Design a protein around this ligand. Structure first.
Ligand code: NA
Ligand code: NA
Lengths: 207, 207
């Protein structure tokens, strides 16, 4: 049982999962992040299929993550791996390729996918989609990368956190957040206090 | 797929479910509410077993809802019906019997149960336990019955709502809340606005 979440914003992408977060990169050219909610076998099978084609593909017509000209094509690669791993839950796949905006996708068991938009700028995967009502109401596509990360982190209620900045083509802001992290506890405590105050205000309204 | 929730407070009990809410009453003596999250067959089987003993029991030693001297005994009756309906998800059962405080229970598939306390004053049932993180942070046992109802209603994000006032032994405050209810939409809109403001405040805090 795992939970993972990702946000597409104007300033880039943010990924979080409580391994369940996988990274591919060609410096200055392309970056990809895959989040998994499935069991260990399912995750390893999909990753191994992706890496098999990166490491051993003889046919140059077969698209890999490193030959895909755009993120829609890169998403199809992952979808093929997801569909093909069934012969042995959803995934989240995002990133950026040079000459195109950062893009984010949710991939279903059969390899079909939907893309994140400004209207629906985030995806959740896992058995329980923790804090979906809060994310629906508060998440906005013009948020700073740090804001979005804080909002995502509050929905985890272990945590590997990646912030990807637009047009950098590298993942440097990588972070493991523990349950013993005092910063994360102060944020969570403040959120509880803010929720109680928010409810106290809206108590004004009837039925 | 159903969701139901109930709160035990100083001033009484509140029940809500999106039939999935069942009522028994002897005026001035005892009141009982059962919430179901299961399919229609499972709910009807448990209710029919309860009613069978109320309507046809020949053995006076067999405890029914109307002979139970206290709510712990009443909970065991429901637990017996829940366990026995397996030979054809959790339930929530609460109420009050004369001479005792209002009490609230969560009943598991095998008929065993746990009781609500001031520390843990609510239960949720259903496939997805919507808004559990909000309820955990905001719910308090000293809330007014209307406050608790508003908090519960916001977690539904169809809705049959019962408020039971302590020592009355009747259910008069009964209400069906629609998705087209303009009061409920104003409360939900205000909650969204309050959540965004609450998040804006706590953005101050780092990682
Ligand atoms: Na805005
Ligand atoms: Na209080």
């Amino acid at each position: 049982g795992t939970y993972a979440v990702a946000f597409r914003l104007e300033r880039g992408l943010v990924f979080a999962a409580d391994k369940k977060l996988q990274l591919w990169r060609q410096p200055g050219e392309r970056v990809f992040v895959l989040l998994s909610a499935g069991n260990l076998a399912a995750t390893q099978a999909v990753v191994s299929l992706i890496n098999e084609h990166l490491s051993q593909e003889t046919d140059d017509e077969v698209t890999t993550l490193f030959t895909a000209p755009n993120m829609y094509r890169a998403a199809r690669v992952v979808g093929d791996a997801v569909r093909e791993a069934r012969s042995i839950t959803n995934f989240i796949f995002g990133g950026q390729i040079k000459g195109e905006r950062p893009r984010l996708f949710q991939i279903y068991p059969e390899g079909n996918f939907i893309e994140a938009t400004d209207d629906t700028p985030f995806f959740q995967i896992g058995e329980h989609k923790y804090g979906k009502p809060i994310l629906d109401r508060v998440a906005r596509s013009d948020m700073r990368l740090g804001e979005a990360a804080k909002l995502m982190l509050l929905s985890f209620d272990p945590i590997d956190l990646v912030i990807y900045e637009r047009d950098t083509f590298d993942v440097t802001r990588e972070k493991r957040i523990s349950a013993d992290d005092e910063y994360f506890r102060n944020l969570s405590n403040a959120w509880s206090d803010a929720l109680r105050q928010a409810f106290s205000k809206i108590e004004e309204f009837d039925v």
